[PDB]
Amino acid sequence: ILPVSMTKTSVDCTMYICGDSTECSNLLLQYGSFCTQLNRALTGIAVEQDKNTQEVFAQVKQIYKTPPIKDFGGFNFSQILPDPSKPSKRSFIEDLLFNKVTNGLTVLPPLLTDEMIAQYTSALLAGTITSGWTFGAGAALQIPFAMQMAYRFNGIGVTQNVLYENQKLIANQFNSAIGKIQDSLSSTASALGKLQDVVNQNAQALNTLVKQLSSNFGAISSVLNDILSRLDPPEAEVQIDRLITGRLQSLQTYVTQQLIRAAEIRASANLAATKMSECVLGQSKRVDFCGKGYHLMSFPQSAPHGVVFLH
Amino acid sequence: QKLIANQFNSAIGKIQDSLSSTASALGKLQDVVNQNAQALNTLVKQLSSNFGAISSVLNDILSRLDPPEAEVQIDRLITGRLQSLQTYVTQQLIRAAEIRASANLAATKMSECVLGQSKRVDFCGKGYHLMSFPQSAPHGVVFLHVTYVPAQEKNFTTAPAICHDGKAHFPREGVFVSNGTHWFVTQRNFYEPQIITTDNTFVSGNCDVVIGIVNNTVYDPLQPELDS
Amino acid sequence: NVFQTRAGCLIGAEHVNNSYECDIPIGAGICASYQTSQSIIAYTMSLGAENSVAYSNNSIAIPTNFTISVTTE
Numbered sequence: 197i198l199p200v201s202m203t204k205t206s207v208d209c210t211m212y213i214c215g216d217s218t219e220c221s222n223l224l225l226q227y228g229s230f231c232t233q234l235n236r237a238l239t240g241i242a243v244e245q246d247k248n249t250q251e252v253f254a255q256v257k258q259i260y261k262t263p264p265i266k267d268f269g270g271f272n273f274s275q276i277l278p279d280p281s282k283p284s285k286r287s288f289i290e291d292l293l294f295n296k297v298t299n300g301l302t303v304l305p306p307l308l309t310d311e312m313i314a315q316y317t318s319a320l321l322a323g324t325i326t327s328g329w330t331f332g333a334g335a336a337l338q339i340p341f342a343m344q345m346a347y348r349f350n351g352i353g354v355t356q357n358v359l360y361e362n363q364k365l366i367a368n369q370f371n372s373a374i375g376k377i378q379d380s381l382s383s384t385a386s387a388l389g390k391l392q393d394v395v396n397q398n399a400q401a402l403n404t405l406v407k408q409l410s411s412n413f414g415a416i417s418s419v420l421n422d423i424l425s426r427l428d429p430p431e432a433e434v435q436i437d438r439l440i441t442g443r444l445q446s447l448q449t450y451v452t453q454q455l456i457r458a459a460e461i462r463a464s465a466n467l468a469a470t471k472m473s474e475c476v477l478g479q480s481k482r483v484d485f486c487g488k489g490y491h492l493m494s495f496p497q498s499a500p501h502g503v504v505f506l507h
Numbered sequence: 508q509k510l511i512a513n514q515f516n517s518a519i520g521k522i523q524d525s526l527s528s529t530a531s532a533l534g535k536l537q538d539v540v541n542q543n544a545q546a547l548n549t550l551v552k553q554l555s556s557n558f559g560a561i562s563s564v565l566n567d568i569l570s571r572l573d574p575p576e577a578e579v580q581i582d583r584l585i586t587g588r589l590q591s592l593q594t595y596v597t598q599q600l601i602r603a604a605e606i607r608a609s610a611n612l613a614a615t616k617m618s619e620c621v622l623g624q625s626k627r628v629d630f631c632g633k634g635y636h637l638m639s640f641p642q643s644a645p646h647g648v649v650f651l652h653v654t655y656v657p658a659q660e661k662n663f664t665t666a667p668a669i670c671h672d673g674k675a676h677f678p679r680e681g682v683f684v685s686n687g688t689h690w691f692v693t694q695r696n697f698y699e700p701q702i703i704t705t706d707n708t709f710v711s712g713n714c715d716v717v718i719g720i721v722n723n724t725v726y727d728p729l730q731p732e733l734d735s
Numbered sequence: 736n737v738f739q740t741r742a743g744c745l746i747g748a749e750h751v752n753n754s755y756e757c758d759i760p761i762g763a764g765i766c767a768s769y770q771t772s773q774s775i776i777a778y779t780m781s782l783g784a785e786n787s788v789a790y791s792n793n794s795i796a797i798p799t800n801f802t803i804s805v806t807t808e
């Protein structure tokens with residue numbers, strides 16, 4: 197499992213710092229470009245946060261779609277192939293992934309919507325099966341399935357006669373193995389530990405970023421008007437000098453996190469798009485890059501602000 | 508060889524006009540520059556701001572004012588102008604670490620995709636990779652990835668083995684195919700049929716366990732040599 | 736002539752029931768574009784442009800001819 201994107205937020209600096217004042221907002225004009233160079237910061241995030249998910253998932257020209265007649269030689273994918281019976285068509289395992297996961301502050305919606313994503317990972321996963329890998333290097337080539345696996349063995353050095361001669365017994369070692377996941381997905385809320393914790397850390401910051409509005413910073417009060425209301429412009433300067441300082445200094449502390457954390461996601465996003473390119477669409481030769489053991493293929497599955505590979 | 512030369516050459520030409528008439532091809536490099544300049548400007552202008560202090564210029568706070576004024580005033584400048592740096596600095600460090608991540612990517616492409624031939628799918632650009640030509644650009648590098656993309660398909664009927672005598676045969680390299688009479692082993696990524704002789708195949712066991720096997724005469728290279 | 740998105744109230748562009756590739760991404764899948772009386776239109780984008788492959792357990796498709804591209808990076 198990997199994170200891919202983090203929640204696109206946006207914070208209007210002006211309003212956070214100075215909520216609702218013509219007074220307060222007249223001091224903040226003096227501190228200069230700060231406010232205006234934050235909103236540029238928090239955008240550069242929100243841009244790329246949609247560039248990530250663009251790069252991971254959509255590597256494919258066209259949306260393929262499965263044939264309605266499923267015969268793969270005994271390999272049973274109905275687990276991972278999507279479900280017409282949901283409103284948004286998400287294969288079984290895709291849904292467990294959803295359930296198991298738990299002042300000027302906006303949150304923007306993601307460009308690609310958690311339904312659309314499910315079309316991609318229902319394309320890759322559906323062009324992986326019929327077309328072999330050749331859809332990554334060109335336009336997909338239908339090839340029988342079990343005449344693919346014979347070409348994902350030669351990749352690991354086992355010669356293909358080890359397939360057709362074992363074919364059945366493999367299918368069960370497969371068809372079973374897929375089954376265990378569900379439990380291990382349903383039994384273990386620590387399967388998702390990665391994604392689960394990202395989403396926390398964000399909402400952990402805001403709850404800290406929000407409580408800041410309650411702080412004295414040495415000023416008389418955390419209600420920005422009760423200063424203003426009670427106390428006079430030649431006085432409330434200093435008192436509001438502090439809050440504007442602190443509440444500002446409390447942004448930068450937050451803005452700096454995001455830039456640091458977002459760069460982290462940005463790094464984990466590339467790792468995905470490298471798997472998703474090499475692992476999914478290819479057969480990866482990089483020992484233990486795609487998971488322990490000689491690697492055969494991999495099936496992407498979307499998860500909220502994340503992606504889950506079955507290797 | 509000759510055809511391929513052209514397909515190469517023409518593809519070279521188009522690149523020029525993919526550039527000469529389009530500046531937005533350089534968007535990446537174009538941004539890295541802007542964001543830099545976009546900092547300094549934003550940094551420079553911070554000199555003009557008063558940070559609450561009673562003037563922008565230091566001298567004019569120096570001159571006009573008594574030190575016990577100037578002191579308390581000059582702080583606000585400093586503390587402001589100081590803090591403006593730490594912003595500007597941090598932005599660099601964070602940004603300059605991003606570059607470092609994209610330098611370490613080129614130094615990889617340079618090593619693998621140029622000096623070698625990369626097996627990593629779509630690391631060198633869509634399609635099977637052949638070679639790469641670095642070209643320098645201002646504060647950045649531009650690769651010309653020469654890739655191999657297949658084109659014109661033909662359907663075929665394919666079967667994973669062949670019973671000849673009841674042993675199987677599996678193709679040694681690349682699939683079996685048939686166009687409807689003459690089975691053909693072939694290499695996978697390009698269509699070059701060949702009649703099936705033992706050099707193409709290697710026997711494994713006997714039929715039944717194979718699933719989808721098909722009859723045929725797997726030709727015998729030796730046998731005609733025995734006409735004597 | 737006002738549209739109601741998931742992202743917000745979008746004033747000044749005419750909804751379209753077609754779906755084309757994205758041009759100016761707005762939010763929640765709604766991509767605006769200028770195509771023609773040329774009026775800014777806003778339309779749910781097609782993720783890719785749909786395809787389907789004919790998969791049948793005995794049938795394979797082998798490219799008979801290739802190309803050579805050159806792709807800047």
Ligand SMILES: *[C@@H]1O[C@H](CO)[C@@H](O[C@@H]2O[C@H](CO)[C@@H](O)[C@H](O)[C@H]2NC(C)=O)[C@H](O)[C@H]1NC(C)=O
Binds near residue numbers: 270271272273274275
């Ligand atoms: C493929 O596996 C799925 C489950 O992974 C099987 O679905 C079950 O099918 C039986 C009918 O034999 C139903 O009674 C069950 O309710 C199904 N399970 C679920 C969770 O819906 C399916 O039978 C298998 N099919 C093939 C062709 O392998």
Ligand SMILES: *[C@@H]1O[C@H](CO)[C@@H](O[C@@H]2O[C@H](CO)[C@@H](O)[C@H](O)[C@H]2NC(C)=O)[C@H](O)[C@H]1NC(C)=O
Binds near residue numbers: 372
């Ligand atoms: C190869 O290994 C697999 C598992 O490691 C064996 O699969 C099981 O074999 C037993 C035989 O005692 C069967 O009863 C089971 O039905 C098999 N599993 C499944 C899922 O079908 C397999 O037997 C091994 N082969 C050899 C020759 O030892």
Ligand SMILES: *[C@@H]1O[C@H](CO)[C@@H](O[C@@H]2O[C@H](CO)[C@@H](O)[C@H](O)[C@H]2NC(C)=O)[C@H](O)[C@H]1NC(C)=O
Binds near residue numbers: 513802
């Ligand atoms: C293989 O494909 C190439 C191009 O994809 C073909 O080359 C072109 O062929 C046409 C006529 O068939 C000529 O008019 C073009 O000038 C050729 N291109 C170039 C760059 O010279 C080639 O003919 C194809 N070969 C087969 C057997 O299909």
Ligand SMILES: *[C@@H]1O[C@H](CO)[C@@H](O[C@@H]2O[C@H](CO)[C@@H](O)[C@H](O)[C@H]2NC(C)=O)[C@H](O)[C@H]1NC(C)=O
Binds near residue numbers: 686687688689
């Ligand atoms: C399948 O391809 C084979 C290989 O060409 C064809 O067999 C030969 O086809 C050529 C076509 O120029 C004829 O001149 C030969 O006489 C054929 N060989 C024999 C022994 O007849 C075959 O015709 C093709 N079949 C189909 C249905 O396309």
Ligand SMILES: *[C@@H]1O[C@H](CO)[C@@H](O[C@@H]2O[C@H](CO)[C@@H](O)[C@H](O)[C@H]2NC(C)=O)[C@H](O)[C@H]1NC(C)=O
Binds near residue numbers: 670720
């Ligand atoms: C390939 O031809 C063989 C002939 O060697 C077929 O095997 C025969 O199958 C029939 C069907 O019941 C039996 O009556 C014969 O006894 C089998 N032959 C022998 C020698 O025992 C086989 O069915 C054919 N299969 C394919 C896929 O072509």
Ligand SMILES: *[C@@H]1O[C@H](CO)[C@@H](O)[C@H](O)[C@H]1NC(C)=O
Binds near residue numbers: 660661662789
């Ligand atoms: C292969 O067969 C399918 C049949 O569904 C057809 O649609 C497709 O066009 C065929 N491809 C070629 C190259 O003839």
Ligand SMILES: *[C@@H]1O[C@H](CO)[C@@H](O)[C@H](O)[C@H]1NC(C)=O
Binds near residue numbers: 267718719720792793
């Ligand atoms: C392929 O599927 C067809 C269904 O039309 C079936 O009749 C045939 O036995 C199958 N053969 C193989 C090799 O999968």
Ligand SMILES: *[C@@H]1O[C@H](CO)[C@@H](O)[C@H](O)[C@H]1NC(C)=O
Binds near residue numbers: 749750751752
């Ligand atoms: C989309 O289609 C529905 C029914 O087909 C129609 O009522 C609606 O007016 C259409 N919307 C636009 C923007 O054309």
